[PDB]
Amino acid sequence: YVAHLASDFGVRVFQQVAQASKDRNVVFSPYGVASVLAMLQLTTGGETQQQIQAAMGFKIDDKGMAPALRHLYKELMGPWNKDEISTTDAIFVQRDLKLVQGFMPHFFRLFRSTVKQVDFSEVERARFIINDWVKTHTKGMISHLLGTGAVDQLTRLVLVNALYFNGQWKTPFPDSSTHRRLFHKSDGSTVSVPMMAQTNKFNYTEFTTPDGHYYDILELPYHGDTLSMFIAAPYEKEVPLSALTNILSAQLISHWKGNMTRLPRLLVLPKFSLETEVDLRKPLENLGMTDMFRQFQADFTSLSDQEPLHVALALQKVKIEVNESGTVASSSTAVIVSARMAPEEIIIDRPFLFVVRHNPTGTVLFMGQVMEP
């Protein structure tokens, strides 16, 4: 119920970063931003608090919620994970602050985590403590956040979410296939980028936005069908990849997955490894949560009814990778390159949209748009 609410909140946050970057590559995690804020919730009280809550659709402290999230987090970092995905949250607050009695223990009760205490007077040190955290929890795949570049002696409250993903395909793409096809930018131009391709009966479906926009929706299962990569791209050119993401919801995906059908086709999908770091500040304000960032309006009295606090910096960084398989070796010169001929073929040579979801719960782990691989 929670994963479903957390999923939408994160998509709603994605729409923001998207609509804020026309014609631009962006990888983002609806789940991640959903988690951090679920925690930031406990620190916030009164005014500011409701903004977050209303915007998220649920109060973390209501019975059942928090534990639900703990559950989902665990099942994600489960056994199947197989080093394919990392995730992490973290709130840093000025140590010396008279935190409200029994807050930390409560926090740890619900999130099995602790609100990190650093001395922002040591700008060089703190700036590091933060980065070092993102490093030690993302398997080193994410060792530095550019945002910290702005932490200074006046910093009081910092929020962070970092994830790294590079799943292992259920059915890996033959290496002896990744040729160097051409890609059309929204720009109008083009570029020859590598594009792997495999022929199989991919779970396919054509979709139509409630306004005359027709996209192709494919589903690429990762090992054990635990996770799935959904790729959606319009038929014609011109058609704004925009249209979809605007009414893109946790429900919608379950709907594409609704009337799909395994069909024989040659899939040509560009390889791509993207990196994104968003300053959740404007995107979150656009969703109503504005008090948290305003100095004499923010209310974190639930955390420290002492000195005036406020989120001085909240951000997310996500490295996503799509390659032949989950990553294996290969021959250095393949003479042949065969495959059963298929009826139709799908060439993803225009900007497309992707979505990684945790099929069991439905969680929208990652989302993003590849405008130029």
Swiss-Prot record:
It comes from the Eukaryota. Inactivated by proteolytic attack of the urokinase-type (u-PA) and the tissue-type (TPA), cleaving the 369-Arg-|-Met-370 bond. SMART domains: SERPIN. GO terms for cellular component: collagen-containing extracellular matrix; extracellular exosome; extracellular region; extracellular space; peptidase inhibitor complex; plasma membrane; platelet alpha granule lumen; serine protease inhibitor complex. The keyword Secreted applies. Its main location: secreted. CDD domains: serpinE1_PAI-1 (cd02051). It is found in: Secreted. The record marks R340, M341 as: Reactive bond. Expressed in endothelial cells. Found in plasma, platelets, and hepatoma and fibrosarcoma cells. InterPro entries: Serpin_CS, Serpin_dom, Serpin_fam, Serpin_sf, Serpin_sf_1, Serpin_sf_2. Glycans are attached at N203, N259, N323. GO terms for biological process: angiogenesis; cellular response to lipopolysaccharide; defense response to Gram-negative bacterium; dentinogenesis; fibrinolysis; negative regulation of blood coagulation; negative regulation of cell adhesion mediated by integrin; negative regulation of cell migration. Induction: Up-regulated by coagulation factor Xa (F10) in atrial tissues. Up-regulated in atrial tissues by rapid pacing resembling atrial fibrillation. Keywords: Glycoprotein, Protease inhibitor, Secreted, Serine protease inhibitor, Signal. One of its GO terms (molecular function) is serine-type endopeptidase inhibitor activity. Belongs to the serpin family. Forms a heterodimer with TMPRSS7. Interacts with VTN. Binds LRP1B; binding is followed by internalization and degradation. Interacts with PPP1CB. In complex with PLAU/uPA, interacts with PLAUR/uPAR. Interacts with SORL1 and LRP1, either alone or in complex with PLAU; these interactions are abolished in the presence of LRPAP1/RAP. The ternary complex composed of PLAUR-PLAU-PAI1 also interacts with SORL1. Interacts with PLAT/tPA. Also interacts with SORL1, when complexed to PLAT/tPA. It is linked to Plasminogen activator inhibitor-1 deficiency: A hematologic disorder characterized by increased bleeding after trauma, injury, or surgery. Affected females have menorrhagia. The bleeding defect is due to increased fibrinolysis of fibrin blood clots due to deficiency of plasminogen activator inhibitor-1, which inhibits tissue and urinary activators of plasminogen. Serine protease inhibitor. Inhibits TMPRSS7. Is a primary inhibitor of tissue-type plasminogen activator (PLAT) and urokinase-type plasminogen activator (PLAU). As PLAT inhibitor, it is required for fibrinolysis down-regulation and is responsible for the controlled degradation of blood clots. As PLAU inhibitor, it is involved in the regulation of cell adhesion and spreading. Acts as a regulator of cell migration, independently of its role as protease inhibitor. It is required for stimulation of keratinocyte migration during cutaneous injury repair. This is Plasminogen activator inhibitor 1. It comes from Homo sapiens. The lineage of its organism: Eukaryota, Metazoa, Chordata, Craniata, Vertebrata. The gene is SERPINE1.
